[PDB]
Design a binder for this molecule. Sequence first.
Ligand SMILES: [Fe+3]
Ligand SMILES: [Fe+3]
Ligand SMILES: [Fe+3]
Ligand SMILES: [Fe+3]
Ligand SMILES: [Fe+3]
Ligand SMILES: [Fe+3]
Ligand SMILES: [Fe+3]
Ligand SMILES: [Fe+3]
Ligand SMILES: [Fe+3]
Ligand SMILES: [Fe+3]
Ligand SMILES: [Fe+3]
Ligand SMILES: [Fe+3]
Ligand SMILES: [Fe+3]
Ligand SMILES: [Fe+3]
Ligand SMILES: [Fe+3]
Ligand SMILES: [Fe+3]
Ligand SMILES: [Fe+3]
Ligand SMILES: [Fe+3]
Lengths: 158, 158, 158, 157, 158
Amino acid sequence: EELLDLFNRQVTQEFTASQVYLSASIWFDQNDWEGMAAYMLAHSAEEREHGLGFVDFANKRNIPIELQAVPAPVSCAEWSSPEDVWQSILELEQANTRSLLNLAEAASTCHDFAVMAFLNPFHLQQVNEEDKIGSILAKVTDENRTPGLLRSLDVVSF
Amino acid sequence: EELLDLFNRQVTQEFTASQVYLSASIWFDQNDWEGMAAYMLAHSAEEREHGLGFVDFANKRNIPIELQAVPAPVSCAEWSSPEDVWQSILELEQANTRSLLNLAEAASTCHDFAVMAFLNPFHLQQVNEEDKIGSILAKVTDENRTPGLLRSLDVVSF
Amino acid sequence: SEELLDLFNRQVTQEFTASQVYLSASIWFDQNDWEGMAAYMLAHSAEEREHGLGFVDFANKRNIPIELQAVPAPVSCAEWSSPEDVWQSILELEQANTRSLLNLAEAASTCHDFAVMAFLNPFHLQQVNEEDKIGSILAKVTDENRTPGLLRSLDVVS
Amino acid sequence: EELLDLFNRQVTQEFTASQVYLSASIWFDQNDWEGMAAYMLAHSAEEREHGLGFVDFANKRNIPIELQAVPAPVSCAEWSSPEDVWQSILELEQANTRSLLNLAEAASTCHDFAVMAFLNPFHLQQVNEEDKIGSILAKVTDENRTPGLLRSLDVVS
Amino acid sequence: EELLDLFNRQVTQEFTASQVYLSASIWFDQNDWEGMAAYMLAHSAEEREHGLGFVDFANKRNIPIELQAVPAPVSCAEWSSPEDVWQSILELEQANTRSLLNLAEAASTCHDFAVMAFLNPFHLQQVNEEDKIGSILAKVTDENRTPGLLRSLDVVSF
Ligand SMILES: [Fe+3]
Ligand SMILES: [Fe+3]
Ligand SMILES: [Fe+3]
Ligand SMILES: [Fe+3]
Ligand SMILES: [Fe+3]
Ligand SMILES: [Fe+3]
Ligand SMILES: [Fe+3]
Ligand SMILES: [Fe+3]
Ligand SMILES: [Fe+3]
Ligand SMILES: [Fe+3]
Ligand SMILES: [Fe+3]
Ligand SMILES: [Fe+3]
Ligand SMILES: [Fe+3]
Ligand SMILES: [Fe+3]
Ligand SMILES: [Fe+3]
Ligand SMILES: [Fe+3]
Ligand SMILES: [Fe+3]
Ligand SMILES: [Fe+3]
C-alpha cells in the first residue's frame, strides 16, 4: 500500500510542479521577460507529460490512481527578481528528484522490478534538469550584477 | 451621424499614428539606432494599412469619408533618448485603443452589428500591440541603465 | 426566448427564399439571352442555399428547432422587362436579407445570446460586401444601358 | 538654406500627393469605378514610397527632416465625372514635376552633385507618369462622349 | 589638363584609402578585434576596386594615367582605441567624398558629361559609406563607455 500511495503522490508532485512552472511564466511575462516566460511555459507542459506518464503506467500495472487537489503555487508572492524565480524552480526540481528517489526506495524494498525499471529514465532526466536549471540560475545571478545586463540575455538566449 | 463622424476620425487617427511612427524612425536613424528605426518604419506602414482598411469598409458600407489634415508629429521636439521615443509610441497606441473602443461603443448604441464585427480583430490587435510596445519600453528602460548597453541590443535584437 | 428562435428560423426561410429569387433571375436572363448575368444569378442562388444550410447546421448544434417553411413562388419576374429591373430586385432582396440579419442580431443581443451573436458576425460582414457588389453592378448596368446594344456587349465581358 | 527647405517641402509634396490619390480612389469607389479606384490606390502607395525615399536619403545625407502636416485634399468636392478626377491628378503630377525641377536647380547652384544624382531617376519617372496619366485622360475624355461607354472600359483596365 | 590631373589623382586617393583600411585591419587584428579587422580588410579591397574602376574608364576615355606613389598610412601611429581608428576612417571617407565632388566640379566646368555620368554612382555610394561609418563610430563610442562592452559586440556584430 505505501508503494501505491507514493506512486499516486508522484502524479500530484508532477502536476504541482507544472503549476509552479506556469506561475513562473506568468511572473516573467508580467515583468516582460518573454524568453524566460517561454522556457517556463514549455517546462510546465513537460511536467504535465511526466505526470500523465505515471498515470498511464499505473493504469497498466493496476495501481489505483486517485487524483488529488493540485495546490495553488504560492512562491510567486515572494518573487521580486528573476533570481528569486529560478531559485524556486531549482528547489522544486530538487524536491521532484527526492520524491522519485523515495519512490524507487519503496519499489526496491518491495522487489518491484517493473517500477524500478520504469523510473530509471526519470532518475537520469532529473540529473540533467537539475544541472541545467543550476547553470541557468548561476548565469542569472552573475549577469544581474550589472544593471540591465540580464535583460540583454533574455533577448539573445531563450 | 456621430457614428459616421467617429468612423471618419479613426482614419485620421491611423494616419496620424503612421506619421508619428515615421517621425520616430527619423529620430532613431539620425541618432544611429537603425534597428529601432526599422521597427518604427515598418509600423508606420502598418498604421497606414489600418487606415486604408477603414477607408475600404467605409466605402463598401456607404459611410462618407472626408480625408482630414494629418497633423505634424510634434513629440520629436521633446525626444532626447530612445526611452522618450518608446514612451510616446506607447501613449500613441493607448490612444489608438481608446479611439477604437469609443467607436465600438457608438456602433453598439446604434446596433450597428457590421461595424462591431469589423472592429473585433482591431480590438485584439491593439491588445497585442500595447503588450509588445510595453515590453520593449521596459527592456529599453532597463538596458539603458548601463552606458552603451542599449546600443548593444539595437544590434542583436531588431 | 421563443421569439429569438422564430427569428433564427425565419433567417433560414429568408435564405431559401432568396435562393429561389436568384434562380428566377437566372431564368429571366437565360430566356432573354443574357447568359453571363444568368450564370452569376445561378451561382448566387447556390450560395444563398449554402447560407441557409449553415444556419440549419448551427441550429441543430445549438438545439434551436427548425421548422422548414414553404419557399414562396417568386413574383418579381412577372414584372421584369429589362436587366435593370432584375438587378434592382436583387439589390432589394439583399437589403431585406441584411435587415433580417440585423433583426436577428438585436434579438440575440437582448437575450445575451453570445453564441448566436458570434455566429452572425461573418454574415454581417458578408452582407456589406454583397450589397456593395450588387449596387455597383446595378450602377454599371444602368449606365451602360443608356446606349443601345452596349449592355450586351458587356454581358460578354463580365 | 534654400536647398534644405526645398528638400523638406518635397517630402511634404509626396505625402500630399499620396493623399490626393487616396481621395481620387475614394471618389471612384463611391461612384462604382472599381478599376480606376484600384489604379489610384496603387499610385497613392507609390507617392508615399517616393516620400520615404527622400526621407531615407536625407537621413543619410544629414539633411534635417521636419515632418509637416499633410494637408487635407480639397479637389474631391468639385469632381463630378471621371474626367474631372484624371484632370486633377494630371495637374498634381505636373506640380510634382515642377517642384522636382526647382529642387534640382537649387542643388545645381549649390554644386550638390549627390542630390542631383539622387534626383535623376525621379525626373525620368515623372516623364513616364505624366505621359501615362495624360494618355489615360485622353482616353477617358474620348470614351465619355458616348453614354455608358466609359464604364464599359473601367471593367477592362 | 586640370581635369585629367584630378582624374589621375582620384586613382591615388582610392589606393591611399585602400592602404589606410589595410592599416586599420592590422591595428584591429593585432589588438584582437577580428570582426572590425575583417570589415576593414573588405573595405580595403573595395577601395582598390574603385581605383581600378577609374583606371579602366580613363583608359577607355584616353585620359593618360600615371600611377603615383601610394603613401605610407601614418594614422596607425596615433591609434590607441577602436574609437581612434573609426574616427580616422570617417575622415578618410569625408576626404574621398570631397575629392569626388571637386572632380565633378571640374568636369562640370569642362562640360564633360561622360565624366559626370561616370561619377554619379560614386557620389551616391559615398553618401551611403559616410552614413554607415558614421553610425558605426557612434555605436563604438557609446559601447566603449562600459569596460569590455565593445568587445562584446565585435563578436556579435561583424
Ligand atoms: Fe517532473
Ligand atoms: Fe522538470
Ligand atoms: Fe522532466
Ligand atoms: Fe493602428
Ligand atoms: Fe499600431
Ligand atoms: Fe496594428
Ligand atoms: Fe413564436
Ligand atoms: Fe415559433
Ligand atoms: Fe412556428
Ligand atoms: Fe444570404
Ligand atoms: Fe447573397
Ligand atoms: Fe452570401
Ligand atoms: Fe511622386
Ligand atoms: Fe506619381
Ligand atoms: Fe512615381
Ligand atoms: Fe573609395
Ligand atoms: Fe570607401
Ligand atoms: Fe565604396
